[PDB]
Each structure stands twice: as C-alpha cells, then as structure tokens.
C-alpha cells in the first residue's frame, strides 16, 4: 500500500444544494474531501443535512470538518459496506491524507504503526500535581 493521490476528476453525488456546506473556513484555513467507490446509486444521508444520491463508481465530496467526513465514513462503512478514504485540503492546493493513514482502518492492526501517547503506567501511578508544578505552562501530571 502507498499513499493515494487525490483525483480531482472524480464526480460528486447528486445533491440539490444545502446551507450546511462550506464556510469561510474552507477558503481561509482548511477543508476536507472524502472519496469512495460505489457499486450502485444509493440515496445516502449527508452529515450537513439532507439526502444525496451517490453515483455508481467513484464519488467525491467536500466538507468543512473532519468529523463530518468520518461521520459519513462510518455511515458508508456500516450501512453500505464501502471503504472510503478522506483527506485534508488546504486553500493553497495542498492535500493531506487523513483516515486510513496506513492503508487499513485504525481499529485493525497493521504490523508496523508506531504507538504514540502511550503512558506505560497505571492511571493511579500518575504523580501528584505538586510535582509537576512550575513546569512552565500549566501541565497535567500525565504530561
């Protein structure tokens, strides 16, 4: 598996237009693009509001928030049994792949993804906040 490049030639589902779509965050900070290959035309539920019709084949869809993309991801994975993958697009054109960051979905092991933010102690073996006092910023004993 290798990181897929975002295809802009991918069509979008049949949506009649909403008001829950993109805001100035898309133009200024960032927005998100989710893609998936469908086997048929199915009326799914937009996380922004309203129902859209996915197209037979590949689809592409814009969203202003990552939680929207993962909501649709779990909806397409659980109700339609698809395998979508979304990105993070910046207004200058930079695309950043996000969800299956190793190819497989994060609930499954991949035999090589590194464990981050793992405290190797018990939650009661954390120190008292008096020991992490005056560490610069206000810091939790979990660090």
């Amino acid at each position: 598996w290798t990181v897929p490049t975002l295809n802009p030639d991918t069509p979008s589902p049949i949506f009649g237009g909403s008001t829950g779509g993109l805001l100035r965050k898309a133009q200024t900070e960032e927005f998100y693009v989710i893609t998936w290959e469908a086997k048929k035309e199915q009326i799914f539920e937009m996380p922004t509001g309203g129902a859209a019709i996915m197209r037979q084949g590949p689809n592409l869809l814009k969203f202003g928030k990552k939680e929207q993309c993962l909501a649709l991801t779990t909806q397409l994975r659980n109700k339609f049994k698809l395998t979508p993958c979304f990105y993070r697009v910046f207004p200058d054109g930079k695309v950043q792949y996000l969800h299956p960051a190793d190819g497989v979905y994060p609930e499954k092991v991949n035999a090589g993804r590194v464990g981050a933010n793992q405290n190797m102690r018990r939650i009661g073996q954390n120190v008292n906040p008096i020991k992490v006092k005056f560490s610069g910023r206000m810091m939790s004993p979990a660090e």
């Binding site: 005056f134 610069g136 910023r137 206000m138």
Partner: protein, 73 residues
C-alpha cells in the same frame, strides 16, 4: 494567527475564538498557571498585587472622604 492579549498563556493566545478573551480575563490572576512562572516570581507578583490592592483601597477611602466633604453635609 497567534494573538497577543494573553501574554501569560500561549495556549490561549493561539485560540482563534472568543474563548481567548474570556479565559484571559479569567486566568489573569492565576499567576501559578501562567507561562514561565517560577515560585519566586509568583510570590513577587503577588507582593506587587497586594500593593496595588492597598493603593486601590486607599484611593477608595480617599474618594469617600472627598465626596462626603464636597457634595455632602
């Protein structure tokens, strides 16, 4: 981008929302949760703040005295 108002907290100064203003108004005197605060600097800022409270109290009594003397009977 990163703002300037919460000089005492860099996590708030990077907040893009209106929460920065409020939480900087309400974390201003929690000196021990400031950025880069030591214990000695804490005690010193508290010393100066007590001096400021004293000045304010005495100005308040001066104002009561002044207004009773001026606009009172």
């Amino acid at each position: 981008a990163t703002k300037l108002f919460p000089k005492f907290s860099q996590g708030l100064a990077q907040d893009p929302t209106t929460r920065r203003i409020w939480y900087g108004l309400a974390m201003a005197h929690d000196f021990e949760s400031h950025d880069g605060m030591t214990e000695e600097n804490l005690y010193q800022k508290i010393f100066a703040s007590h001096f400021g409270q004293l000045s304010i109290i005495f100005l308040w009594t001066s104002g009561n005295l002044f207004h009773v003397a001026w606009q009172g009977n």
